[PDB]
Each structure stands twice: as C-alpha cells, then as structure tokens.
Design a protein around this ligand. Structure first.
Ligand SMILES: C[C@](O)(C/N=c1/sc2cccc3c2n1CCC3)C(=O)N1CCN(c2cccc3cnccc23)CC1
Length: 268
C-alpha cells in the first residue's frame, strides 16, 4: 500500500490507518495464525483476556437478554463465557473479510479457523461442566446475527432494528478504529446508544501502543494510557465498576504496547 516500512498502511495522508485499509489490505486468516495460534506473549495475553471474561461473565454479575459484540474481528475467544450469561449475542465488524471468517465459523465449515485449543482452555477455567464440542454448540446457537459495524458512525449499526442491549462488549477494537481521543470518546457515546440505562460496557484493549503488525504489514493504533481511557469512558456517560491493567505486552515484532487494559462500566 505504497508507504512500506516508513508509515502504517493507509496512514500517509491521514496520520492514522484509514478504515478502507481494513476492507482492502487486510487478511484475517493471516492475522489469526499469528496472534491466535495458542507459552508465548500471544498465548499468555489470550489466557488473561479469557480469565477476565470468565470473571466478568461467569464469576460476577453481567447476565442478560442481548449482548452486542462490537468489532469482533474474525475471532470468537471473547464470546465463550458470555454464551452462558446471555440468551442471544449479536456480533459485528467493519471488515466484510472478518464477518466472512465469523460466518464460516458459525457454519462449522472445515475451511474456518480452528478454535479447539482456545475453547478447551476456557472449558478448564469453567470447571469443565461441558467439553469443547458442547461449548462451541452453545455459542453458535447464541449468535443470532452477524452485522456490519462502524463505531465512528452516529448510528453504529445503521438501519438495523436491534433491541436495547444489556451488555456491549468490545475487545481489541477502538485502538485501531479511532484515530484520536475525540473519536475514542465519541465512539463510546455511540456504543451507549445501543445500551440500556445501567447497562454494562466491557472494554479490553492494548495500552500505549502506536502500531501493531500482521506480518510485515503495519497498522495504526492510538497510544493511550490508563488515565486517558479512564477519562474517555467517564466523559462518555459511564460509571466505571472496575479497571484492570496488566503489564504483559505483545512480542517485539507484533506491537509496541506497554500492557493491556480490561474494564467494566455501566451506562449512567
Ligand atoms: C484484527 C483487528 O485489527 C483487531 N486486532 C488487533 S490485534 C492487536 C494487537 C495489538 C494492538 C492492537 C491490536 N488490534 C486492534 C488494534 C490495537 C480487527 O479486526 N479490528 C480492529 C479494527 N476495527 C475497525 C477498524 C476501523 C473502523 C472500525 C469501525 N467500527 C468497528 C471496527 C472498526 C475492525 C476490527
């Protein structure tokens, strides 16, 4: 995409990877093979996101009718615990390439990525009430829609009539989606329009990361800290229930994050 090494793809005119670059120059299966192979940085990070989700959805409250999952990418690790606390899930993404990988996975098509190592891992955290083939069927039955997203749009779902949600989940999304704090803050107001009053916001993402790599192809990220996200959340109409910060970072070659944040909020 012209630039090559000097600046992330689709970030020369703008200074941040434009949304177009996610539709055209983005291979989702290449990304899944890199980050979600699954005791490296990636595996340890995925294991921490998983523990936080098992605690949010299985250990604590966060029970409901409908959970809208914003910017799911081509991944399902983030929905394994919520398919126990929610009667229905509505997954979304900007990339059609990503929505495709999700739709292939809901069909159990052999050409879809293997989530077996991950699914079995979450089963072990839950005590193993069920096994992999049983856990994946609960989650697939729970996915009611796969829709196009745009957190950087007043109506994040467009014309789709969706009922108010009890939870809105977003993992590893807004750092790539928003190019500056005004957009990060606005994109959180947009998530609130999908949420019920006193409804949960669950956000997980990297801290202090300005880029992330998918091979040799580079992508933009918003380098923000704990103070920056804490402030962005509260100003967008949310009361923060708890905020976790971990020091684990992605390997040298994969991103310059100083750690990762996990937080639960409530639309107030
Ligand atoms: C693969 C992935 O890039 C997500 N993976 C990762 S792995 C990793 C590792 C380290 C750091 C980071 C990181 N990231 C996210 C960025 C930070 C993806 O699938 N994303 C995020 C970007 N996203 C959108 C783009 C533009 C506009 C959007 C509008 N609405 C909704 C979504 C939109 C689409 C879904």
């Amino acid at each position: 995409h012209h630039s090559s090494g000097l600046v992330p793809r689709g970030s020369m005119e703008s200074g941040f990877t434009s949304k177009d670059t996610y539709l055209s120059h983005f291979n989702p299966r290449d990304y899944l093979e890199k980050y979600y192979k699954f005791h490296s940085a990636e595996s340890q990070i995925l294991k921490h996101l998983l523990k936080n989700l098992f605690k949010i959805f299985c250990l604590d409250g966060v029970k409901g009718d409908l959970l809208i999952d914003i910017g799911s990418g081509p991944t399902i690790y983030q929905l394994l615990s919520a398919c126990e606390s929610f009667k229905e899930i509505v997954v979304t993404d900007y990339s059609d390439q990503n929505l495709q990988e999700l739709e292939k996975w809901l069909k159990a098509a052999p050409a879809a990525f293997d989530w077996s190592p991950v699914v079995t891992y979450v089963c072990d955290l839950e005590g193993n009430r069920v096994k992999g083939p049983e856990k994946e069927e609960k989650l697939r039955q729970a996915v009611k829609q796969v829709l196009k997203c745009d957190v950087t749009q007043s109506q994040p779902l467009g014309a789709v009539p969706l009922p108010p949600a009890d939870c809105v989940l977003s993992t590893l999304c807004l750092d790539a989606a928003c190019p500056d704090l005004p957009t990060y803050c606005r994109a959180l107001r947009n998530l609130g329009s999908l949420l019920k009053p006193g409804g949960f916001l669950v956000i997980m993402d990297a801290l202090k990361s300005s880029y992330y790599m998918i091979g040799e192809q580079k992508f933009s990220s918003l380098p923000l800290g704990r103070e920056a996200v804490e402030a962005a959340v509260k100003e967008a109409g949310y009361t923060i229930e708890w905020f976790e910060v971990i020091s684990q970072s992605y390997s040298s070659t994969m991103a310059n994050n100083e750690g990762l944040f996990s937080l639960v909020a409530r639309k107030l």
